[PDB]
Protein backbone atom coordinates (compact mmCIF):
# COMPACT_ATOMS: atom_id res chain seq x y z
CA UNK A 1 0.00 0.00 0.00
CA UNK A 2 1.86 3.22 -1.12
CA UNK A 3 1.65 6.40 0.99
CA UNK A 4 -0.89 8.84 -0.45
CA UNK A 5 0.78 11.24 -2.92
CA UNK A 6 0.69 15.00 -2.17
CA UNK A 7 -0.59 17.20 -5.09
CA UNK A 8 2.06 18.65 -7.40
CA UNK A 9 3.80 22.05 -7.54
CA UNK A 10 1.54 22.89 -10.51
CA UNK A 11 -1.66 21.62 -8.87
CA UNK A 12 -3.22 25.09 -9.44
CA UNK A 13 -3.65 24.00 -13.07
CA UNK A 14 -5.69 20.93 -12.06
CA UNK A 15 -9.27 22.30 -12.19
CA UNK A 16 -9.09 22.54 -16.01
CA UNK A 17 -8.05 19.95 -18.55
CA UNK A 18 -4.76 20.57 -20.40
CA UNK A 19 -6.73 21.25 -23.61
CA UNK A 20 -8.66 24.11 -21.99
CA UNK A 21 -5.33 25.68 -20.92
CA UNK A 22 -3.95 25.33 -24.43
CA UNK A 23 -7.10 26.83 -25.96
CA UNK A 24 -7.13 29.69 -23.41
CA UNK A 25 -3.61 30.56 -24.59
CA UNK A 26 -4.61 30.48 -28.26
CA UNK A 27 -7.77 32.46 -27.46
CA UNK A 28 -5.60 35.01 -25.64
CA UNK A 29 -3.38 35.42 -28.72
CA UNK A 30 -6.32 35.53 -31.12
CA UNK A 31 -8.11 38.19 -29.05
CA UNK A 32 -4.96 40.27 -28.75
CA UNK A 33 -4.16 40.14 -32.47
CA UNK A 34 -7.75 40.92 -33.51
CA UNK A 35 -7.90 43.85 -31.03
CA UNK A 36 -4.67 45.32 -32.51
CA UNK A 37 -5.94 44.88 -36.07
CA UNK A 38 -9.36 46.48 -35.55
CA UNK A 39 -7.76 49.32 -33.59
CA UNK A 40 -5.18 50.20 -36.28
CA UNK A 41 -8.13 50.03 -38.64
CA UNK A 42 -9.78 52.89 -36.64
CA UNK A 43 -2.37 55.46 -25.24
CA UNK A 44 -3.15 53.21 -28.20
CA UNK A 45 -3.71 49.56 -28.98
CA UNK A 46 -0.53 48.46 -30.62
CA UNK A 47 0.29 44.77 -30.31
CA UNK A 48 2.16 45.04 -26.96
CA UNK A 49 -0.63 47.02 -25.34
CA UNK A 50 -3.23 44.69 -26.85
CA UNK A 51 -1.42 41.80 -25.21
CA UNK A 52 -1.29 43.74 -21.91
CA UNK A 53 -4.98 44.72 -22.05
CA UNK A 54 -6.11 41.16 -22.76
CA UNK A 55 -3.92 39.75 -19.98
CA UNK A 56 -5.27 42.20 -17.44
CA UNK A 57 -8.87 41.52 -18.53
CA UNK A 58 -8.35 37.81 -18.13
CA UNK A 59 -6.70 38.23 -14.70
CA UNK A 60 -9.50 40.57 -13.59
CA UNK A 61 -7.24 43.55 -13.10
CA UNK A 62 -7.58 46.17 -15.84
CA UNK A 63 -4.83 48.50 -16.95
CA UNK A 64 -4.16 51.93 -18.37
CA UNK A 65 -6.38 51.76 -21.41
CA UNK A 66 -9.76 50.70 -22.81
CA UNK A 67 -10.87 50.44 -26.48
CA UNK A 68 -12.86 53.39 -27.88
CA UNK A 69 -14.00 52.07 -31.28
CA UNK A 70 -17.08 49.94 -31.85
CA UNK A 71 -15.06 46.99 -33.15
CA UNK A 72 -12.55 47.31 -30.29
CA UNK A 73 -15.44 47.30 -27.80
CA UNK A 74 -17.02 44.27 -29.40
CA UNK A 75 -13.70 42.43 -29.00
CA UNK A 76 -13.26 43.68 -25.43
CA UNK A 77 -16.87 42.80 -24.52
CA UNK A 78 -16.71 39.21 -25.74
CA UNK A 79 -13.32 38.72 -24.07
CA UNK A 80 -14.82 40.02 -20.79
CA UNK A 81 -17.69 37.56 -21.14
CA UNK A 82 -15.30 34.70 -21.89
CA UNK A 83 -13.23 35.67 -18.88
CA UNK A 84 -16.21 35.75 -16.54
CA UNK A 85 -17.28 32.22 -17.56
CA UNK A 86 -13.79 30.67 -17.53
CA UNK A 87 -12.48 32.31 -14.32
CA UNK A 88 -15.76 31.57 -12.51
CA UNK A 89 -15.48 27.93 -13.51
CA UNK A 90 -11.80 27.77 -12.59
CA UNK A 91 -12.16 29.45 -9.22
CA UNK A 92 -15.23 27.49 -8.06
CA UNK A 93 -13.50 24.51 -6.40
CA UNK A 94 -9.92 25.66 -6.54
CA UNK A 95 -8.84 25.01 -2.96
CA UNK A 96 -10.20 21.42 -3.28
CA UNK A 97 -7.82 20.70 -6.21
CA UNK A 98 -4.86 22.16 -4.26
CA UNK A 99 -5.36 19.66 -1.40
CA UNK A 100 -6.23 16.28 -2.94
CA UNK A 101 -4.18 13.17 -2.14
CA UNK A 102 -4.32 10.27 -4.60
CA UNK A 103 -3.07 6.69 -4.70
CA UNK A 104 -0.58 5.82 -7.48
CA UNK A 105 -13.10 17.88 6.67
CA UNK A 106 -12.30 21.61 6.28
CA UNK A 107 -8.63 22.47 6.91
CA UNK A 108 -6.62 25.63 6.28
CA UNK A 109 -4.48 25.63 3.16
CA UNK A 110 -0.81 25.06 3.96
CA UNK A 111 2.21 26.74 2.41
CA UNK A 112 3.13 23.41 0.78
CA UNK A 113 -0.21 23.44 -1.07
CA UNK A 114 0.60 26.78 -2.75
CA UNK A 115 4.43 26.67 -2.80
CA UNK A 116 4.43 26.35 -6.60
CA UNK A 117 2.62 29.66 -7.01
CA UNK A 118 5.41 31.24 -4.93
CA UNK A 119 8.17 29.63 -7.06
CA UNK A 120 6.55 31.00 -10.25
CA UNK A 121 6.32 34.43 -8.60
CA UNK A 122 9.99 34.61 -7.50
CA UNK A 123 11.03 33.09 -10.85
CA UNK A 124 9.13 35.89 -12.62
CA UNK A 125 10.81 38.57 -10.48
CA UNK A 126 14.20 37.06 -11.34
CA UNK A 127 13.30 37.02 -15.02
CA UNK A 128 12.11 40.63 -14.81
CA UNK A 129 15.43 41.74 -13.31
CA UNK A 130 17.34 39.82 -15.99
CA UNK A 131 15.27 41.34 -18.84
CA UNK A 132 15.84 44.78 -17.24
CA UNK A 133 19.65 44.36 -17.25
CA UNK A 134 19.55 43.26 -20.91
CA UNK A 135 17.22 46.08 -22.04
CA UNK A 136 19.70 48.35 -20.20
CA UNK A 137 22.99 47.05 -21.66
CA UNK A 138 21.39 47.02 -25.15
CA UNK A 139 20.35 50.70 -24.75
CA UNK A 140 23.74 51.54 -23.11
CA UNK A 141 25.53 50.39 -26.32
Amino acid sequence: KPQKSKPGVFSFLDPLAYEIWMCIVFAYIGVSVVLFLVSRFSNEFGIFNSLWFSLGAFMQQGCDISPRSLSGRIVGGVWWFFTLIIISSYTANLAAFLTVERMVKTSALSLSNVAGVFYILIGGLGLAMLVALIEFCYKSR
Binding site: G30, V33, R40
Partner: protein, 174 residues
Protein backbone atom coordinates in the same frame (compact mmCIF):
# COMPACT_ATOMS: atom_id res chain seq x y z
CA UNK B 1 13.96 46.96 -41.41
CA UNK B 2 11.70 46.73 -44.54
CA UNK B 3 13.76 43.78 -45.86
CA UNK B 4 13.77 41.83 -42.56
CA UNK B 5 10.01 42.42 -42.08
CA UNK B 6 9.28 41.10 -45.59
CA UNK B 7 11.66 38.15 -45.05
CA UNK B 8 9.90 37.21 -41.79
CA UNK B 9 6.56 37.64 -43.59
CA UNK B 10 7.47 35.47 -46.60
CA UNK B 11 9.32 32.68 -44.75
CA UNK B 12 6.63 32.77 -42.05
CA UNK B 13 3.81 32.54 -44.60
CA UNK B 14 5.49 29.52 -46.22
CA UNK B 15 6.18 27.88 -42.85
CA UNK B 16 2.56 28.34 -41.70
CA UNK B 17 1.09 27.00 -44.95
CA UNK B 18 3.47 24.00 -44.98
CA UNK B 19 2.88 23.05 -41.34
CA UNK B 20 -0.89 23.34 -41.76
CA UNK B 21 -0.99 21.34 -45.02
CA UNK B 22 1.16 18.56 -43.55
CA UNK B 23 -1.07 18.53 -40.46
CA UNK B 24 -4.29 18.22 -42.49
CA UNK B 25 -2.76 15.50 -44.69
CA UNK B 26 -0.88 13.38 -42.13
CA UNK B 27 -2.39 10.98 -39.53
CA UNK B 28 -0.56 11.56 -36.25
CA UNK B 29 -3.19 13.75 -34.57
CA UNK B 30 -4.18 11.25 -31.88
CA UNK B 31 -2.53 8.19 -30.30
CA UNK B 32 -5.46 6.18 -28.86
CA UNK B 33 -6.25 2.47 -28.65
CA UNK B 34 -8.66 1.19 -31.29
CA UNK B 35 -9.00 -0.95 -34.45
CA UNK B 36 -7.86 -0.55 -38.09
CA UNK B 37 -10.14 -3.51 -39.01
CA UNK B 38 -8.37 -3.37 -29.55
CA UNK B 39 -4.82 -2.24 -30.37
CA UNK B 40 -2.75 0.97 -30.08
CA UNK B 41 -3.55 3.21 -33.10
CA UNK B 42 -2.55 6.60 -34.51
CA UNK B 43 -5.38 8.60 -36.09
CA UNK B 44 -5.82 11.85 -38.01
CA UNK B 45 -8.67 13.87 -39.51
CA UNK B 46 -9.42 11.22 -42.13
CA UNK B 47 -7.91 7.81 -41.22
CA UNK B 48 -7.10 5.47 -38.32
CA UNK B 49 -4.02 3.22 -38.54
CA UNK B 50 -2.49 0.53 -36.29
CA UNK B 51 1.00 0.69 -34.69
CA UNK B 52 1.06 -2.83 -33.18
CA UNK B 53 0.31 -6.36 -34.43
CA UNK B 54 -0.07 -8.25 -37.72
CA UNK B 55 -2.08 -5.31 -39.13
CA UNK B 56 0.67 -2.76 -38.24
CA UNK B 57 0.40 -0.14 -41.01
CA UNK B 58 -3.16 -1.05 -42.09
CA UNK B 59 -5.19 2.16 -42.18
CA UNK B 60 -8.99 2.51 -42.33
CA UNK B 61 -11.24 5.50 -43.06
CA UNK B 62 -12.94 7.03 -40.01
CA UNK B 63 -16.71 6.64 -39.65
CA UNK B 64 -17.64 10.15 -38.50
CA UNK B 65 -21.30 9.06 -38.41
CA UNK B 66 -21.56 5.69 -36.51
CA UNK B 67 -29.89 16.36 -31.28
CA UNK B 68 -29.17 19.27 -33.65
CA UNK B 69 -26.07 20.29 -31.64
CA UNK B 70 -24.58 16.78 -31.77
CA UNK B 71 -25.39 16.47 -35.50
CA UNK B 72 -23.76 19.83 -36.28
CA UNK B 73 -20.65 18.86 -34.31
CA UNK B 74 -20.43 15.53 -36.21
CA UNK B 75 -20.94 17.26 -39.58
CA UNK B 76 -18.40 20.05 -38.97
CA UNK B 77 -15.89 17.50 -37.62
CA UNK B 78 -16.49 15.11 -40.54
CA UNK B 79 -15.92 17.72 -43.25
CA UNK B 80 -12.90 19.26 -41.44
CA UNK B 81 -14.18 22.50 -42.95
CA UNK B 82 -12.27 24.60 -40.39
CA UNK B 83 -8.78 23.03 -40.87
CA UNK B 84 -9.34 23.17 -44.66
CA UNK B 85 -10.53 26.76 -44.53
CA UNK B 86 -7.40 27.56 -42.49
CA UNK B 87 -5.24 26.04 -45.27
CA UNK B 88 -7.16 27.98 -47.95
CA UNK B 89 -6.77 31.34 -46.18
CA UNK B 90 -3.05 30.69 -45.60
CA UNK B 91 -2.80 29.97 -49.33
CA UNK B 92 -4.40 33.32 -50.23
CA UNK B 93 -2.37 35.16 -47.59
CA UNK B 94 0.85 33.87 -49.16
CA UNK B 95 -0.50 34.76 -52.60
CA UNK B 96 -1.08 38.37 -51.48
CA UNK B 97 2.42 38.43 -49.92
CA UNK B 98 3.88 37.49 -53.33
CA UNK B 99 1.66 40.02 -55.14
CA UNK B 100 2.89 42.77 -52.75
CA UNK B 101 6.37 42.61 -54.37
CA UNK B 102 5.10 43.21 -57.94
CA UNK B 103 2.07 45.55 -57.89
CA UNK B 104 3.39 47.86 -55.15
CA UNK B 105 1.08 50.77 -56.18
CA UNK B 106 -1.85 49.33 -54.20
CA UNK B 107 -0.70 49.12 -50.55
CA UNK B 108 -3.83 47.20 -49.46
CA UNK B 109 -2.44 43.91 -50.86
CA UNK B 110 -0.07 43.40 -47.87
CA UNK B 111 -2.89 44.37 -45.50
CA UNK B 112 -5.15 41.74 -47.10
CA UNK B 113 -2.31 39.24 -46.54
CA UNK B 114 -2.44 40.25 -42.87
CA UNK B 115 -6.22 39.78 -42.64
CA UNK B 116 -5.98 36.36 -44.34
CA UNK B 117 -3.33 35.18 -41.86
CA UNK B 118 -5.26 36.48 -38.84
CA UNK B 119 -8.44 34.78 -40.12
CA UNK B 120 -6.51 31.56 -40.90
CA UNK B 121 -5.54 31.44 -37.22
CA UNK B 122 -9.15 31.97 -36.08
CA UNK B 123 -10.25 29.15 -38.39
CA UNK B 124 -7.49 27.00 -36.89
CA UNK B 125 -8.66 27.63 -33.27
CA UNK B 126 -12.23 26.63 -34.23
CA UNK B 127 -10.88 23.49 -35.90
CA UNK B 128 -8.91 22.43 -32.82
CA UNK B 129 -11.92 23.01 -30.57
CA UNK B 130 -14.18 20.98 -32.88
CA UNK B 131 -11.56 18.21 -33.12
CA UNK B 132 -11.05 17.85 -29.36
CA UNK B 133 -14.77 18.28 -28.62
CA UNK B 134 -15.76 15.61 -31.17
CA UNK B 135 -13.23 13.10 -29.74
CA UNK B 136 -15.21 13.26 -26.50
CA UNK B 137 -6.47 7.24 -22.44
CA UNK B 138 -4.98 9.17 -25.39
CA UNK B 139 -2.21 11.55 -26.43
CA UNK B 140 -1.74 14.07 -29.25
CA UNK B 141 0.88 13.43 -31.92
CA UNK B 142 3.07 15.67 -34.05
CA UNK B 143 0.39 16.42 -36.69
CA UNK B 144 -1.69 18.04 -33.97
CA UNK B 145 1.26 20.15 -32.80
CA UNK B 146 1.94 21.19 -36.42
CA UNK B 147 -1.58 22.65 -36.59
CA UNK B 148 -0.85 24.45 -33.30
CA UNK B 149 2.49 25.86 -34.52
CA UNK B 150 0.77 26.94 -37.75
CA UNK B 151 -1.65 29.00 -35.65
CA UNK B 152 1.18 30.69 -33.78
CA UNK B 153 3.15 31.48 -36.96
CA UNK B 154 0.06 32.73 -38.83
CA UNK B 155 -0.73 35.14 -35.99
CA UNK B 156 2.89 36.42 -35.94
CA UNK B 157 2.85 36.92 -39.72
CA UNK B 158 -0.52 38.69 -39.55
CA UNK B 159 0.94 41.12 -37.03
CA UNK B 160 4.04 41.79 -39.16
CA UNK B 161 2.01 42.25 -42.36
CA UNK B 162 -0.17 44.81 -40.55
CA UNK B 163 2.99 46.60 -39.33
CA UNK B 164 4.33 46.76 -42.92
CA UNK B 165 1.11 48.44 -44.07
CA UNK B 166 1.26 50.92 -41.16
CA UNK B 167 4.74 52.27 -41.90
CA UNK B 168 3.73 52.40 -45.59
CA UNK B 169 0.75 54.66 -44.75
CA UNK B 170 2.96 56.57 -42.23
CA UNK B 171 5.84 57.08 -44.71
CA UNK B 172 3.81 58.21 -47.76
CA UNK B 173 1.33 60.51 -45.90
CA UNK B 174 4.29 62.64 -44.69
Amino acid sequence: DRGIQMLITTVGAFAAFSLMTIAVGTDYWLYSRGVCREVMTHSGLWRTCCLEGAFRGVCKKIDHFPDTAEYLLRAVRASSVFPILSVTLLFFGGLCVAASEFHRSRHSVILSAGIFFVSAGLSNIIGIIVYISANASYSYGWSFYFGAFSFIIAEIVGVVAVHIYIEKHQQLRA
